[PDB]
Design a protein around this ligand. Structure first.
Ligand SMILES: [Mg+2]
Ligand code: NA
Ligand code: NA
Ligand SMILES: [Zn+2]
Length: 673
């Protein structure tokens, strides 16, 4: 098991805020709806409200009756995140003791509700009673996407089994998760003619495959059957056959299904007894249907459906391949609803990162690491307000919007949000996981190989070996990454040659001698390491312009792995949003800010102006790096346009990921005088 301490100050703050937020939740309030539906004493507690409202006005903080709600979804994410925080290195010993006690109380409380519910309703024994079993699988009575909500609890239980230090808690989580899988099988055999894939079910196949790994031998086949009930093979077949069926599909609905296809692959290939239990046909389909569907999905998404920050979707859906400008700009800027601002739901990138991660673990292809790094910085890290810890729903791509974050719904950050009842969007629930597990994908151990997935100052150890690796990195503020190795034994360090680096300037020095950048068949350079190894890896950052396939005149700028944004106008977090959907905050457009994002070359064409951008961002470039590399931290990166007219001439471009106090431009409108 990896242990990774994080020395990067921006990521330390991000992770510490999340631990504080997780600690602000009370177990009895998380447990209210489970208890109520199971007939157990609720101790007069209220649920946390918003998407965690239930049907009953006396238990809902806002007093509403049968509101649109997603009961259990955020409780499930909280179990995941509080578990992840036990494994991660942001929480102190004392924070971990308290959060672990809280996790144990929630896991035991849900198990108790499950068991009490099973006696009230034997036919549905094993159901997690977050809401009425009568609305499975399509919802009803204001309860939306039941299987999606249950998926979070089931996924949560696996994380608690994996990461709780409390033996009873692990055993309780396993019993709960296996009993829920048995429920899925019993429910579906009783409702054999009911389609349970038409309504969003989250990553239920994924979670159940993960349950099969933890189940007792005599339960595995039952859990595998449950998992496979949630494999949408008709979708997978289309994808495997090289179709792009995505136009009109809900994006966050779809992505986790393919992570579940990959979990099937992993579950069967990593347990020889399971692998051997398949037919020859089934065995071949692991590769020809499941892996192939996921590989092809990932590729079509990144090539044809992805914005410069690694994100996808508009109004929560995929649209026409390549029509990114159209989706981001031709859907209105009026306040409220889901319009231009509704690009790049943040859940989608949490899911894309998990898909890239399991594709990496199976294939070792460096392209998945390049994507991971890019999207982790420019969509996930970018999603957080560094003062509050809260996270985004949408990420607008058209210029002139602010970033809008959620609220706590707890006494955390009361100086910002006062006594307001929380909302607990999906994006806030994936959000808490993003920051609880923030250090889980820096390095991957595989036999005596150690893959460097991202470049961050950190220290890596693993209980399976006796080497310690300390990385110091600041890219792209400074260009040298160093590694220092201590301990005993040997290993093979695997390094990516980033596409974002100026290729001819990349240099690898190992123990004071330059090494060639020879790649293995998966794209990795390999360095033998042992005690006292010292590596300097020079990665000069490339400045580049990235347009949309459907509009050469809508252009974002990126320096090394950091997408830049222009700071346009001041924003006020108290008034800069409206509502859309179910209690979702959506950004309000600033048309004066948008007007500043016109990039008008003083002389010549837009094409010639773009050609005059230099990769090294030096004097003479049409976009010039202005910060001193040797002063300030990474977020002090700063750029200015040159040879342009109007307001853009005076703007600062800085990292998108750290921009939150102003409206911003990621994509600029290139225009002739
Ligand atoms: Mg796992
Ligand atoms: Na083009
Ligand atoms: Na001001
Ligand atoms: Zn979401």
């Amino acid at each position: 098991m990896e242990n990774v301490t994080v020395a990067d100050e921006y990521l330390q703050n991000a992770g510490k805020k999340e631990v504080e937020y997780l600690l602000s939740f009370e177990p009895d309030r998380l447990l209210v709806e489970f208890r109520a539906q199971a007939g157990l004493d609720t101790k007069g507690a209220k649920n946390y409200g918003g998407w965690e409202n239930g049907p009953d006005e006396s238990r809902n903080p806002d007093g509403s009756s049968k509101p649109g709600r997603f009961t259990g979804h955020f409780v499930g994410h909280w179990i995941s995140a509080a578990s992840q925080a036990q494994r991660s290195t942001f929480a102190t010993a004392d924070q971990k003791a308290q959060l672990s006690a809280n996790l144990t109380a929630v896991v035991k409380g849900i198990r108790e509700a499950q068991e009490a519910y099973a006696k009230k309703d034997t036919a549905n024994a094993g159901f997690f009673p977050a809401f009425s079993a009568s609305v499975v699988p399509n919802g009803g009575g204001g309860l939306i996407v039941p299987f999606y909500n249950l998926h979070k609890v089931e996924a949560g239980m696996v994380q608690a089994y994996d990461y709780s230090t409390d033996a009873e808690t692990r055993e309780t989580a396993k019993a709960a998760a296996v009993d829920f899988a048995k429920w899925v099988v019993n429910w579906k055999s009783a409702h054999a003619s009911t389609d349970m894939l038409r309504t969003e079910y989250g990553g239920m196949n994924d979670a159940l495959y993960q349950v099969a790994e933890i189940a007792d031998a005599s339960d595995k086949q039952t859990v595998l059957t449950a998992a496979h009930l949630f494999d949408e093979t008709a979708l997978f077949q289309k994808l495997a056959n090289g179709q792009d069926p995505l136009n009109g599909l809900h994006a966050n609905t779809t992505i986790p299904k393919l992570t579940g296809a990959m979990q099937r692959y992993v579950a069967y290939t990593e347990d020889e007894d399971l692998y051997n239990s398949l037919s020859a046909d089934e065995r071949g389909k692991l590769t020809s249907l499941y892996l192939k569907a996921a590989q092809n999905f990932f590729d079509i998404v990144v090539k044809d459906h992805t914005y410069v920050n690694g994100g996808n979707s508009q109004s929560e859906h995929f649209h026409v391949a390549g029509e990114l400008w159209k989706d981001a700009t031709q859907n209105g800027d009026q306040n409220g609803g889901y319009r231009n601002f509704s690009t790049v739901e943040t859940c989608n990138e949490y899911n894309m990162l998990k898909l890239a991660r399991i594709l990496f673990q199976v294939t070792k292809d460096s392209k998945y690491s390049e994507y991971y790094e890019h999207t982790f910085i420019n969509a996930i890290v970018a999603s957080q307000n560094p003062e509050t810890g809260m996270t985004t729903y949408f990420q607008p791509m058209k210029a002139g919007y602010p970033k809008v974050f959620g609220i706590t719904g707890t006494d955390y950050d009361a100086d910002w949000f006062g006594g307001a009842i929380g909302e607990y969007w999906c994006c806030q629930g994936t959000g808490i996981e993003n920051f609880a597990k923030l250090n889980d994908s820096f390095y991957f151990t595989d036999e005596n190989n150690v893959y460097v997935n991202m470049f961050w100052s950190s220290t890596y150890t693993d209980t399976r070996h006796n080497l310690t690796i300390t990385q110091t990195a600041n890219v792209p503020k400074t260009e040298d990454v160093t590694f220092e190795v201590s301990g005993t034994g040997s290993a093979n360090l695997k390094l990516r040659v980033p596409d974002w680096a100026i290729t001819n300037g990349v240099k690898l020095v190992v123990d004071g001698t330059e090494q060639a950048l020879t790649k293995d068949e998966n794209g990795w350079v390999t360095v033998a390491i042992k005690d006292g190894a010292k590596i300097t890896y020079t990665l000069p950052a490339k400045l580049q312009a990235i347009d949309a396939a459907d509009n050469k005149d809508w252009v974002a700028f990126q320096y090394g792995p950091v997408v830049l944004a222009g700071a346009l106008t001041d924003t006020n977090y108290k008034t800069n949003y409206s509502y859309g959907g179910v209690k979702v905050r959506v950004a309000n457009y600033d048309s004066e800010a948008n007007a500043k994002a016109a990039v008008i070359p003083t002389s010549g064409s837009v094409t010639d102006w773009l050609k005059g951008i230099k990769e090294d961002a030096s004097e003479g470039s049409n976009l010039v790096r202005t910060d001193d590399p040797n002063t300030g931290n990474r977020e002090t990166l700063s750029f200015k346009f040159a040879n342009v007219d109007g307001d853009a001439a005076d703007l600062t471009l800085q990292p998108y990921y750290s921009t939150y106090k102003t409206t911003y431009a990621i994509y600029w409108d290139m225009a002739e005088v």
